[PDB]
Design a protein around this ligand. Sequence first.
Ligand SMILES: *[C@@H]1O[C@H](CO)[C@@H](O[C@@H]2O[C@H](CO)[C@@H](O[C@@H]3O[C@H](CO)[C@@H](O)[C@H](O)[C@@H]3O)[C@H](O)[C@H]2NC(C)=O)[C@H](O)[C@H]1NC(C)=O
Ligand SMILES: *[C@@H]1O[C@H](CO)[C@@H](O[C@@H]2O[C@H](CO)[C@@H](O[C@@H]3O[C@H](CO)[C@@H](O)[C@H](O)[C@@H]3O)[C@H](O)[C@H]2NC(C)=O)[C@H](O)[C@H]1NC(C)=O
Ligand SMILES: *[C@@H]1O[C@H](CO)[C@@H](O[C@@H]2O[C@H](CO)[C@@H](O)[C@H](O)[C@H]2NC(C)=O)[C@H](O)[C@H]1NC(C)=O
Ligand SMILES: *[C@@H]1O[C@H](CO)[C@@H](O)[C@H](O)[C@H]1NC(C)=O
Ligand SMILES: *[C@@H]1O[C@H](CO)[C@@H](O)[C@H](O)[C@H]1NC(C)=O
Ligand SMILES: *[C@H]1O[C@H](CO)[C@@H](O)[C@H](O)[C@H]1NC(C)=O
Lengths: 48, 612
Amino acid sequence: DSECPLSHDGYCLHDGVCMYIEALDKYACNCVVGYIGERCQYRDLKWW
Amino acid sequence: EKKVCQGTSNKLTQLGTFEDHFLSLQRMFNNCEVVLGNLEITYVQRNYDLSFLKTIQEVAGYVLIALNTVERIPLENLQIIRGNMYYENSYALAVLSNYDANKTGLKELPMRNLQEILHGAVRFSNNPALCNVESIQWRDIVSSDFLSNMSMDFQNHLGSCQKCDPSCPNGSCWGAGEENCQKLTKIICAQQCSGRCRGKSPSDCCHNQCAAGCTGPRESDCLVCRKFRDEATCKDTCPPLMLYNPTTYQMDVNPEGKYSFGATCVKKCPRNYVVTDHGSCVRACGADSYEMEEDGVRKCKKCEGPCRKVCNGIGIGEFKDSLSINATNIKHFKNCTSISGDLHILPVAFRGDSFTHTPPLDPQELDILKTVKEITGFLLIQAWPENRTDLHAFENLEIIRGRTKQHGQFSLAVVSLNITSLGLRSLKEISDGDVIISGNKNLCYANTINWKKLFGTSGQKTKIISNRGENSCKATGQVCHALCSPEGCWGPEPRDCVSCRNVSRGRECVDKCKLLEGEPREFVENSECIQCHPECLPQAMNITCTGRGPDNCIQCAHYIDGPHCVKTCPAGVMGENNTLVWKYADAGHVCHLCHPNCTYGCTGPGLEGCPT
Ligand SMILES: *[C@@H]1O[C@H](CO)[C@@H](O[C@@H]2O[C@H](CO)[C@@H](O[C@@H]3O[C@H](CO)[C@@H](O)[C@H](O)[C@@H]3O)[C@H](O)[C@H]2NC(C)=O)[C@H](O)[C@H]1NC(C)=O
Ligand SMILES: *[C@@H]1O[C@H](CO)[C@@H](O[C@@H]2O[C@H](CO)[C@@H](O[C@@H]3O[C@H](CO)[C@@H](O)[C@H](O)[C@@H]3O)[C@H](O)[C@H]2NC(C)=O)[C@H](O)[C@H]1NC(C)=O
Ligand SMILES: *[C@@H]1O[C@H](CO)[C@@H](O[C@@H]2O[C@H](CO)[C@@H](O)[C@H](O)[C@H]2NC(C)=O)[C@H](O)[C@H]1NC(C)=O
Ligand SMILES: *[C@@H]1O[C@H](CO)[C@@H](O)[C@H](O)[C@H]1NC(C)=O
Ligand SMILES: *[C@@H]1O[C@H](CO)[C@@H](O)[C@H](O)[C@H]1NC(C)=O
Ligand SMILES: *[C@H]1O[C@H](CO)[C@@H](O)[C@H](O)[C@H]1NC(C)=O
């Protein structure tokens, strides 16, 4: 899994990937389908 | 109102493909009226129906609308944004960059019922297609405290822009047609209104508990409740869980007490819901805490060490085929309080290795292990920055278990080092391995400690061999502190004794407790110095308090209420039903219950206390 420079400098988990919004100057994750939250840290609660 | 959805916190993170992401937004917000959390609308493309958002009345967190290409976001009945959580440190509503390589996207954001953003400011940046929003008077939506904290930018020369309706207040609307004229309920108003209004005149005043405007004068006539909606009344706070017991003069269990679910007061927590010490129903606890069932209802409690993180260790698992902690290594051990295996620190760390393509590690980074509290295998330190006089990164190491031991003999080994002192002030157990402290030609205190008190298997020995001589340190004046006990030293400082000769203050060894002359005043209990409670008035040359808590002061700093010393007399607290408890203070500073026919409060005894 990949080191991602967000506000709280975590890691995108559950197979997700780090991406950069150039417009803003801000990082975020690209979660795999079926996972939620900024760092992809949560099962969708319905999608399983 | 009703119907409640959880909200999202994805900030700008994107969920699968644009479709995947649209489908989530959808299933989250479908038929939802009240958002408990936040509303983040992002990445939505041209010609995707966001009709479902027509349904949203209250958002509790913040509203983030960014990186969209949709022409139209119909937040048409969004009434209030509470801003209980900000975006980017300060905005309750951020509407940032809603275009694509073309200069198009959000044209339309018809928020004709947005009347109050309760907390937080508002930001608009780079929406070269957004119409009419240009014109709004935020002075009516946003509270003055966040007025000087807005970033406002709408930068199109022309466009698909209809002028507002002639029937609009100083030319402000959210879009085309009368339906979109901005409804003002705070600007135009009345000296007399201390809140919001139904119109230009004094009789139009809304109750102070209403948030966006009202349909009348009552607390049941509010459009939205400023704080809590308990049944069909707006209130300041939910009926308290704790109530005032006149017989204990402290807070007791309130059977008529209600928890707090969004801006609602409930009899009990829904679905699968934990409770906070704000008295709130929530889906999950914060990061600095994590608890289970404490008599029936699941409560949230504090880990007071940074929450337990189990981490691999050198040799096993993800760190397999690694010689020691490295530059490549040492990040992966951040919030780690326990090592499920060994810890090696070897010369190759601080010199670096050609073979494994590993730069020398920066000696300041060693501070990442300050959190580690248990090593399960063994600890082996064979190198260490010479600049560093201490094993201080392991300051808080409580236990080494030795379940595995170096060469199958050693649980702790400190070898060929420059240190002055073993920094291990929190070490209390080394159960099943032998100890090796060797070649540390400057290490001075390792003898003072009785290693035998630390062992858990009755066959383990020590080898404090080939350090300095007992004679050397003694002469260098490098002994235990005069305030330690025979038990030992992990170094020179008073913070560094195993146990105290006289008295402990929190963590340090000390001579006097602050009985007659200290900073805050103290008592002693089990040869510890414990602070007096802040309501004990310090006594010159005499004892200030006689235990913990407020019924142990010799004299109250402020007021007396039964056996308590209190900062203020009880003023409008919840009671053993029918009313709020109200006391005044008598010239002796004793609190006494106001006359029952008051209700507003009083300033003295009897009916002469509360005037009309
Ligand atoms: C300092 O720590 C880093 C992080 O552990 C170490 O890097 C790791 O080195 C090992 C051994 O060279 C690599 O694992 C190997 O993978 C091969 C697959 O071909 C496998 O057959 C071997 O048995 C072995 O497990 C690993 O890729 C590598 N990890 C990273 C991210 O670099 C480094 O070895 C350590 N150096 C020192 C001086 O302790
Ligand atoms: C994992 O390690 C990181 C990095 O050391 C830790 O970051 C820490 O983040 C917290 C935020 O909650 C900081 O707490 C402090 O809160 C007080 C009180 O509000 C405030 O005055 C401080 O400015 C600060 O935000 C903590 O100091 C900070 N550490 C560093 C190096 O600045 C974090 O503790 C760890 N994460 C977990 C969940 O254990
Ligand atoms: C500390 O406490 C005791 C009170 O129990 C003080 O001693 C009393 O002082 C008054 C003088 O105004 C005498 O009338 C009492 O007879 C004393 N009581 C006893 C039992 O001796 C003592 O004064 C206090 N110390 C200080 C500095 O005020
Ligand atoms: C009765 O006590 C309850 C405890 O839940 C409290 O909420 C309420 O304020 C009291 N009654 C009134 C109307 O003051
Ligand atoms: C400090 O320690 C000694 C015991 O070794 C004791 O005599 C003394 O009372 C203690 N406290 C003070 C006031 O020095
Ligand atoms: C290593 O420790 C010794 C002994 O305490 C100290 O005098 C010396 O300065 C240290 N060496 C370096 C290079 O910092």
